[PDB]
Design an enzyme around this catalytic site. Structure first.
Site, PDB file in Angstrom:
ATOM      1  CG  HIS A   1     -80.935  47.449 -40.506  1.00 30.42           C
ATOM      2  ND1 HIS A   1     -82.109  46.973 -40.294  1.00 30.42           N
ATOM      3  CD2 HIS A   1     -80.178  47.753 -39.115  1.00 30.42           C
ATOM      4  CE1 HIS A   1     -82.440  47.005 -38.860  1.00 30.42           C
ATOM      5  NE2 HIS A   1     -81.319  47.483 -38.316  1.00 30.42           N
TER       6      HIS A   1
ATOM      7  CE  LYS B   1     -82.975  43.370 -34.328  1.00 39.66           C
ATOM      8  NZ  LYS B   1     -83.777  44.238 -35.290  1.00 39.66           N
TER       9      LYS B   1
ATOM     10  CG  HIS C   1     -81.506  53.333 -34.774  1.00 39.29           C
ATOM     11  ND1 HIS C   1     -81.645  51.979 -34.005  1.00 39.29           N
ATOM     12  CD2 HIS C   1     -82.725  53.839 -34.873  1.00 39.29           C
ATOM     13  CE1 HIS C   1     -82.797  52.032 -33.478  1.00 39.29           C
ATOM     14  NE2 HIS C   1     -83.705  53.028 -34.088  1.00 39.29           N
ATOM     15  CG  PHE C   2     -83.894  50.487 -40.361  1.00 41.68           C
ATOM     16  CD1 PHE C   2     -83.495  50.933 -41.589  1.00 41.68           C
ATOM     17  CD2 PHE C   2     -85.409  50.227 -40.057  1.00 41.68           C
ATOM     18  CE1 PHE C   2     -84.563  50.888 -42.548  1.00 41.68           C
ATOM     19  CE2 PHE C   2     -86.131  50.405 -41.207  1.00 41.68           C
ATOM     20  CZ  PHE C   2     -86.077  50.735 -42.495  1.00 41.68           C
ATOM     21  CG  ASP C   3     -86.035  56.070 -36.073  1.00 41.87           C
ATOM     22  OD1 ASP C   3     -85.625  55.765 -34.955  1.00 41.87           O
ATOM     23  OD2 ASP C   3     -87.001  57.021 -35.914  1.00 41.87           O
TER      24      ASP C   3
END
Length: 124
Positions: A12, A41, A119-121
Site C-alpha cells: 500500500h 491480485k 491492514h488497508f480497510d
C-alpha cells in the site's frame, strides 16, 4: 517472515510520487510489489503520502473495521491514492489493471509498537 506492518508498506505505500499520473502505473506497481507472482491480485490501493503522514492516521478518527475489530482509523484529511483494479479480461501471467487516481480518506487497521497500519480497510 514478513511482518504485517511491513506487508502494509509493500502492498500500500508509494510515497515516491504525489500521484499515479500514467495508465501503466498499476500494471508496473502491482508486478514490482510481488502482487502478480502466482496470480493477479484483483484489487489494491496505493497511498502517495509520506509514511509519517500515513502512520499518523493511527492517532486520528477511531472507527470500526470491516471485520468488527475496533482498531481502525480514518484519516481526518483526504490523501492522494491510486486504485488498481484488474480488468475484466486480464489473464495471469499477463496481469492487466485499470489505474484510477483519487483523493480520499483512508481507513486502516493499526497495531503493534510502534503503532502503525497493518491492514488497508477502505478509502471513503
Amino acid at each position: 517472515k514478513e511482518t504485517a506492518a511491513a506487508k502494509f508498506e509493500r502492498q500500500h505505500m508509494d510515497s515516491s510520487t504525489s500521484a499515479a499520473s500514467s495508465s501503466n502505473y498499476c500494471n508496473q506497481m502491482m508486478k514490482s510489489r510481488n502482487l502478480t507472482k502466482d496470480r493477479c491480485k484483483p484489487v489494491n490501493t496505493f497511498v502517495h503520502e509520506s509514511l509519517a503522514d500515513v502512520q499518523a492516521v493511527c492517532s486520528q478518527k477511531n472507527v470500526a473495521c470491516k471485520n468488527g475489530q475496533t482498531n481502525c482509523y480514518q484519516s481526518y484529511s483526504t490523501m492522494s491514492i491510486t486504485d488498481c483494479r484488474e480488468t475484466g479480461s486480464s489473464k495471469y501471467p499477463n496481469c492487466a489493471y485499470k489505474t484510477t487516481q483519487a483523493n480520499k480518506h483512508i481507513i486502516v487497521a493499526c497495531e503493534g509498537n510502534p503503532y502503525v497500519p497493518v491492514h488497508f480497510d477502505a478509502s471513503v
